Amino acid sequence: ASQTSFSFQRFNETNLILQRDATVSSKGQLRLTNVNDNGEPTLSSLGRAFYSAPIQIWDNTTGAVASFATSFTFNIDVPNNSGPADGLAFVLLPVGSQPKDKGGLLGLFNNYKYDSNAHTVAVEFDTLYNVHWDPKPRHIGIDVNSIKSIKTTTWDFVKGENAEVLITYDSSTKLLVASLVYPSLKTSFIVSDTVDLKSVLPEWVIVGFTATTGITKGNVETNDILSWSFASKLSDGT
Amino acid sequence: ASQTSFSFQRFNETNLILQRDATVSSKGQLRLTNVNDNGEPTLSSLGRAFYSAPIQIWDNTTGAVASFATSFTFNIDVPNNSGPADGLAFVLLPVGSQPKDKGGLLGLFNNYKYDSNAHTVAVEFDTLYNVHWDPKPRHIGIDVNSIKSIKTTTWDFVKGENAEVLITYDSSTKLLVASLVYPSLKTSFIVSDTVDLKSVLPEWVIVGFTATTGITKGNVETNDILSWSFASKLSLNLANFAL
Amino acid sequence: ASQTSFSFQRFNETNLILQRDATVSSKGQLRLTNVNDNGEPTLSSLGRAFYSAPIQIWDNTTGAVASFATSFTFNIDVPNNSGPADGLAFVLLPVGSQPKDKGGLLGLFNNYKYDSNAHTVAVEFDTLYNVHWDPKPRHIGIDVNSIKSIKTTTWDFVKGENAEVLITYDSSTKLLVASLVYPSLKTSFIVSDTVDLKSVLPEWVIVGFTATTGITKGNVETNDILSWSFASKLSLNLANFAL
Amino acid sequence: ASQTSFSFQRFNETNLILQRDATVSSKGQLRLTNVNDNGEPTLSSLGRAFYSAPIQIWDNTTGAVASFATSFTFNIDVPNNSGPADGLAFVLLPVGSQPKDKGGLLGLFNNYKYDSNAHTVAVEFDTLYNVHWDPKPRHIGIDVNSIKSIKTTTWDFVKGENAEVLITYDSSTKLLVASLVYPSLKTSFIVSDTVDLKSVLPEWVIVGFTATTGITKGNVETNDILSWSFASKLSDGT
Ligand SMILES: CC(=O)N[C@H]1[C@H](O[C@H]2[C@@H](O)[C@H](O)[C@@H](CO)O[C@@H]2O)O[C@H](CO)[C@@H](O)[C@@H]1O
Ligand SMILES: CC(=O)N[C@H]1[C@H](O[C@H]2[C@@H](O)[C@H](O)[C@@H](CO)O[C@@H]2O)O[C@H](CO)[C@@H](O)[C@@H]1O
Numbered sequence: 001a002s003q004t005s006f007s008f009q010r011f012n013e014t015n016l017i018l019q020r021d022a023t024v025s026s027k028g029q030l031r032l033t034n035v036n037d038n039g040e041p042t043l044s045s046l047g048r049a050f051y052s053a054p055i056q057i058w059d060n061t062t063g064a065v066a067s068f069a070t071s072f073t074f075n076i077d078v079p080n081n082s083g084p085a086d087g088l089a090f091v092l093l094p095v096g097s098q099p100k101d102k103g104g105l106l107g108l109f110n111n112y113k114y115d116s117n118a119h120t121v122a123v124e125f126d127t128l129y130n131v132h133w134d135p136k137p138r139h140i141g142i143d144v145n146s147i148k149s150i151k152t153t154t155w156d157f158v159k160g161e162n163a164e165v166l167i168t169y170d171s172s173t174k175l176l177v178a179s180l181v182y183p184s185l186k187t188s189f190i191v192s193d194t195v196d197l198k199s200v201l202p203e204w205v206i207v208g209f210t211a212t213t214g215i216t217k218g219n220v221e222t223n224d225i226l227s228w229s230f231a232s233k234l235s236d237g238t
Numbered sequence: 239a240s241q242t243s244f245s246f247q248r249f250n251e252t253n254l255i256l257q258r259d260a261t262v263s264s265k266g267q268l269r270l271t272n273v274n275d276n277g278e279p280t281l282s283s284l285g286r287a288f289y290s291a292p293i294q295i296w297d298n299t300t301g302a303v304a305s306f307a308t309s310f311t312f313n314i315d316v317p318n319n320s321g322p323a324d325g326l327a328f329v330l331l332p333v334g335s336q337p338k339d340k341g342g343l344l345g346l347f348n349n350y351k352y353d354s355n356a357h358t359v360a361v362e363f364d365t366l367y368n369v370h371w372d373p374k375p376r377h378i379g380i381d382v383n384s385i386k387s388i389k390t391t392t393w394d395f396v397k398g399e400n401a402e403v404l405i406t407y408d409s410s411t412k413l414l415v416a417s418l419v420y421p422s423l424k425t426s427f428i429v430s431d432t433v434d435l436k437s438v439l440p441e442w443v444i445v446g447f448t449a450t451t452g453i454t455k456g457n458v459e460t461n462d463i464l465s466w467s468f469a470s471k472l473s474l475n476l477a478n479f480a481l
Numbered sequence: 482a483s484q485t486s487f488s489f490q491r492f493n494e495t496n497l498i499l500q501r502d503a504t505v506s507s508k509g510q511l512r513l514t515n516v517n518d519n520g521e522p523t524l525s526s527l528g529r530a531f532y533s534a535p536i537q538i539w540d541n542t543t544g545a546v547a548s549f550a551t552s553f554t555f556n557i558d559v560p561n562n563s564g565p566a567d568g569l570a571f572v573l574l575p576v577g578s579q580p581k582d583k584g585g586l587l588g589l590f591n592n593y594k595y596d597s598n599a600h601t602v603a604v605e606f607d608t609l610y611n612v613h614w615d616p617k618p619r620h621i622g623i624d625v626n627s628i629k630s631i632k633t634t635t636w637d638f639v640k641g642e643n644a645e646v647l648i649t650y651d652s653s654t655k656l657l658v659a660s661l662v663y664p665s666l667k668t669s670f671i672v673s674d675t676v677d678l679k680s681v682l683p684e685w686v687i688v689g690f691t692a693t694t695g696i697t698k699g700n701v702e703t704n705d706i707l708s709w710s711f712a713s714k715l716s717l718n719l720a721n722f723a724l
Numbered sequence: 725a726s727q728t729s730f731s732f733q734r735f736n737e738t739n740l741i742l743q744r745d746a747t748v749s750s751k752g753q754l755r756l757t758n759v760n761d762n763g764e765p766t767l768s769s770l771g772r773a774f775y776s777a778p779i780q781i782w783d784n785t786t787g788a789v790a791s792f793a794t795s796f797t798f799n800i801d802v803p804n805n806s807g808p809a810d811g812l813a814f815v816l817l818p819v820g821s822q823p824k825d826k827g828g829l830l831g832l833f834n835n836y837k838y839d840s841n842a843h844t845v846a847v848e849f850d851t852l853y854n855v856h857w858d859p860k861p862r863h864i865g866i867d868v869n870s871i872k873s874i875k876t877t878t879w880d881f882v883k884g885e886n887a888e889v890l891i892t893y894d895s896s897t898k899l900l901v902a903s904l905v906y907p908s909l910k911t912s913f914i915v916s917d918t919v920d921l922k923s924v925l926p927e928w929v930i931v932g933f934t935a936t937t938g939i940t941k942g943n944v945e946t947n948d949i950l951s952w953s954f955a956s957k958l959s960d961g962t
């Protein structure tokens with residue numbers, strides 16, 4: 001009986017917390033990583049954006065854990081004669097969280113080891129194979145306190161096509177499910193694993209996105225969020 | 239303009255149209271196919287169950303088509319020294335529709351040929367390979383006027399495990415998406431394809447389920463619905479719905 | 482456990498149970514009482530309209546009672562050199578209920594005496610003073626098994642102005658609240674009282690409307706429903722509902 | 725198609741902006757004005773509390789105006805041998821708004837004249853007659869840029885009884901409606917007037933409450949919010 005819900009088809013900076021390169025465009029697109037005046041994404045970009053209100057994920061008195069779901073449309077595009085990098089992620093982080101390392105660490109980590117004090121749960125849409133931890137194919141991944149996903153599924157990434165994502169968390173089964181569909185291509189992908197939010201996250205978090213572009217010439221992308229809905233519910237006992 | 243929503247964690251016959259073998263158990267479960275007096279599914283069973291109010295899927299005056307979503311939990315169980323058959327489906331059908339042939343035709347069809355006047359959109363959960371039309375592995379299928387799915391994905395069926403399904407239809411993209419998760423196994427499956435509702439279905443439909451048991455000894459299953467939510471809008475927020 | 486919600490900005494007969502004179506106009510309006518071929522309401526008319534699916538209001542196993550809310554826009558208009566009669570009501574009634582006596586009994590009652598087997602909870606919008614039971618001024622009333630309201634408030638009725646109604650029932654406090662606003666006049670009215678649903682209504686009900694025209698020359702009105710939303714929950718967020 | 729919704733049966737300070745004397749108690753009650761360790765409210769108190777995310781009320785490009793609704797339960801109680809003062813209000817204010825004068829000005833105004841730059845829309849629950857502007861009976865009032873309500877209705881205030889309020893705004897009719905019911909007493913009250921949000925408010929606002937206690941001995945109250953739900957919807961055009 002704590003409940004929060006929002007849904008935006010267009011964005012504005014007034015109710016968002018924007019970090020580093022993240023901007024809202026004059027078309028109300030949330031552009032997580034830098035794009036120049038020619039409309040070309042640039043290298044070594046990092047941006048993160050969050051809803052301005054913190055969200056209660058669990059409660060240390062009752063032991064209750066929230067159920068949540070989020071949907072969003074994103075557009076990742078690539079200039080001709082480049083390949084994509086590095087990707088974007090929906091995230092749950094500590095209130096006051098600041099950006100970490102760029103590139104393949106997605107602004108979320110400092111290295112590729114597990115860190116039980118990272119307090120990070122993310123669903124990544126990873127467009128670049130990082131030899132020290134990634135599966136080879138592009139992938140949707142569930143990340144808990146590491147850039148090395150606890151679970152992944154192959155994602156047949158296609159540049160410039162709008163991708164519609166749904167992520168759900170059921171606190172009774174502890175199941176986190178992420179799916180992506182490309183409506184114009186009629187293709188769909190799904191990954192699922194259990195996550196113990198209560199052991200990983202603080203009681204309150206900020207929710208939103210992080211994204212990076214490649215550090216090396218020829219590996220680059222736009223990372224645009226086009227719409228976002230979020231809902232959470234945390235039982236209080238009446 | 240029009241919105242409809244319902245959600246049941248337990249079922250009752252009062253607001254449901256039950257057909258053939260479909261019963262509401264005394265524990266509030268929707269048993270679509272017959273279980274005997276001991277707790278065993280029986281062969282050749284067919285049952286269909288629908289919400290008692292018709293849903294408007296599209297409008298010929300405005301041309302608008304509904305978006306909808308549905309979620310349900312189901313339990314398919316199989317007796318020992320037996321295999322599963324034949325599966326269950328969520329369906330959209332014309333008002334007043336009657337059960338068709340049982341078995342692998344799921345109470346929805348007379349034959350395995352394409353029938354352009356069947357007016358059927360269904361998402362099937364197929365537990366038995368029918369050599370004449372099915373893919374070999376167990377599958378989730380999107381059925382449009384035919385038992386031969388327009389698209390399927392592999393489903394790693396496991397007996398007696400609760401399965402959670404989400405089906406969504408986006409009228410702006412004409413995309414129908416169906417996913418199933420087994421929460422205790424942490425496995426997940428998704429299939430997607432476009433369906434033009436306006437040329438397949440009448441303007442008003444009934445929504446619900448159909449299921450069958452196998453007709454041949456050793457091929458049988460329970461087809462139980464444990465909970466069901468539906469929403470439609472005709473002129474969806476999926477984060478809100480899934481919650 | 483159980484939740485039901487619907488919202489219509491335009492009506493269609495397909496999902497409605499229409500009774501006596503109640504028609505859906507070709508412009509999607511729910512005309513509860515008869516209008517002639519020219520656009521004039523006629524005397525002695527009675528019409529009732531219900532959502533086609535039964536709603537569960539309470540459960541005898543658990544003891545739980547539903548909370549619900551409903552909102553609707555209505556237009557009561559009156560011809561020149563005439564006064565209004567007899568009004569319209571939102572009702573909860575047993576499944577299969579038939580119209581009762583017309584006129585000031587609103588199609589809900591046979592007489593003006595308390596009937597403990599009428600199984601009726603209604604919110605009336607009363608346009609005609611019935612000397613034997615009504616307060617003198619026009620009123621909103623909460624009717625429980627009787628046409629003599631358990632509670633009323635003064636309603637400054639104005640002909641042909643759209644009226645927006647909100648009715649809520651909180652099962653935890655047993656409180657039923659009804660309010661009406663005239664947006665173009667900026668006037669508002671509210672009445673509240675407790676109703677014990679569990680001892681008045683069956684476990685399953687039909688929700689909808691009833692209306693009547695006056696039986697005596699010069700007392701007549703249109704009773705039109707322009708839009709309708711309903712929600713119930715059986716184990717409400719009113720900020721969400723009203724929006 | 726911008727939509728925001730929240731509903732809390734218990735409060736926590738983490739997602740609220742609290743000003744001056746406002747606190748959240750260990751029972752998760754939002755206590756807008758000061759209460760001492762004996763549970764007695766004190767004089768000359770002022771507190772305000774807001775949801776931490778700003779809410780978009782209108783849009784200067786499309787001219788669209790939001791529809792909203794809010795419900796809340798409040799408890800105003802009075803020690804024996806005092807009378808109540810001064811009351812509480814649900815408010816829509818500029819982002820960054822700071823408290824104004826205490827007592828009968830409810831933390832919202834500096835005097836009792838109209839001020840077209842106050843950017844204030846409030847629904848007041850006024851428990852003390854202020855001779856220079858109030859109607860004599862206690863009242864629910866609609867306030868637009870003045871402590872002198874544009875419209876009022878008599879409120880039969882009863883100390884210590886939970887009051888359930890619903891406030892709705894329809895941007896198509898511009899009608900603001902406020903109602904209060906006391907469920908244990910079965911009584912109910914309603915006020916309605918039109919308000920042009922676009923001429924009064926900035927495009928984005930903070931939503932929440934303000935309350936004060938009397939400045940003069942014998943005029944005092946608790947001003948506790950017990951639950952709160954809010955929803956708004958602003959058309960974007962798809
Ligand atoms: C080792 C590796 O993964 N190299 C790829 C490189 O990755 C960058 C940086 O993004 C990574 O976070 C760190 C991991 O320590 O390594 C490098 O510094 O990104 C390139 C594209 O920009 C790839 O071509 C390399 O394969
Ligand atoms: C040909 C075939 O599919 N045989 C399988 C059989 O199918 C039944 C029935 O279920 C089908 O609907 C019709 C299709 O015309 O054929 C048969 O009568 O079901 C058996 C289990 O019940 C399978 O083992 C057969 O392979």
Ligand SMILES: CC(=O)N[C@H]1[C@H](O[C@H]2[C@@H](O)[C@H](O)[C@@H](CO)O[C@@H]2O)O[C@H](CO)[C@@H](O)[C@@H]1O
Pocket residue numbers: 566567583584585586609610611612613695696697700
């Ligand atoms: C006695 C009375 O109420 N007379 C009014 C009359 O009422 C009709 C009918 O509407 C009532 O239901 C029954 C109650 O027994 O009495 C009459 O038959 O309606 C007239 C307008 O139609 C009023 O002017 C009478 O005052």
Ligand SMILES: CC(=O)N[C@H]1[C@H](O[C@H]2[C@@H](O)[C@H](O)[C@@H](CO)O[C@@H]2O)O[C@H](CO)[C@@H](O)[C@@H]1O
Pocket residue numbers: 809826827828829852853854855856938939940941943
């Ligand atoms: C003049 C008046 O209203 N006096 C009442 C007094 O009001 C305070 C303060 O609360 C008001 O905002 C200002 C208006 O200029 O006047 C006074 O300073 O509050 C008393 C209770 O504390 C009442 O008894 C007075 O009637």
Ligand SMILES: *[C@@H]1O[C@H](CO)[C@@H](O)[C@H](O)[C@H]1NC(C)=O
Pocket residue numbers: 011012013014024025026027028927928
């Ligand atoms: C966001 O809103 C404010 C108006 O409050 C405006 O100043 C700003 O330019 C807006 N940005 C966009 C992209 O709409």
Ligand SMILES: *[C@@H]1O[C@H](CO)[C@@H](O)[C@H](O)[C@H]1NC(C)=O
Pocket residue numbers: 249250251252262263264265266267684685
């Ligand atoms: C269905 O509802 C009726 C009450 O109207 C009741 O007799 C029956 O027990 C209900 N079924 C279940 C499974 O609860």
Ligand SMILES: *[C@@H]1O[C@H](CO)[C@@H](O)[C@H](O)[C@H]1NC(C)=O
Pocket residue numbers: 441442492493494495505506507508509510
């Ligand atoms: C009711 O629905 C049917 C389509 O099934 C249509 O023929 C009729 O025009 C509809 N009524 C209105 C008022 O639109």
Ligand SMILES: *[C@@H]1O[C@H](CO)[C@@H](O)[C@H](O)[C@H]1NC(C)=O
Pocket residue numbers: 203204735736737738748749750751752
């Ligand atoms: C609010 O939440 C935080 C836990 O994140 C806690 O420190 C604080 O004491 C809480 N207050 C109440 C009243 O629950």
Ligand SMILES: [Ca+2]
Pocket residue numbers: 086104126127128129130134
């Ligand atoms: Ca990578």
Ligand SMILES: [Ca+2]
Pocket residue numbers: 324342364365366367368372
């Ligand atoms: Ca088959």
Ligand SMILES: [Ca+2]
Pocket residue numbers: 567585607608609610611615
């Ligand atoms: Ca009357």
Ligand SMILES: [Ca+2]
Pocket residue numbers: 810828850851852853854858
């Ligand atoms: Ca005052």
Ligand SMILES: [Mn+2]
Pocket residue numbers: 124126134135139141147149
């Ligand atoms: Mn990866």
Ligand SMILES: [Mn+2]
Pocket residue numbers: 362364372373377379385387
């Ligand atoms: Mn099949």
Ligand SMILES: [Mn+2]
Pocket residue numbers: 605607615616620622628630
């Ligand atoms: Mn009456």
Ligand SMILES: [Mn+2]
Pocket residue numbers: 848850858859863865871873
């Ligand atoms: Mn006042």
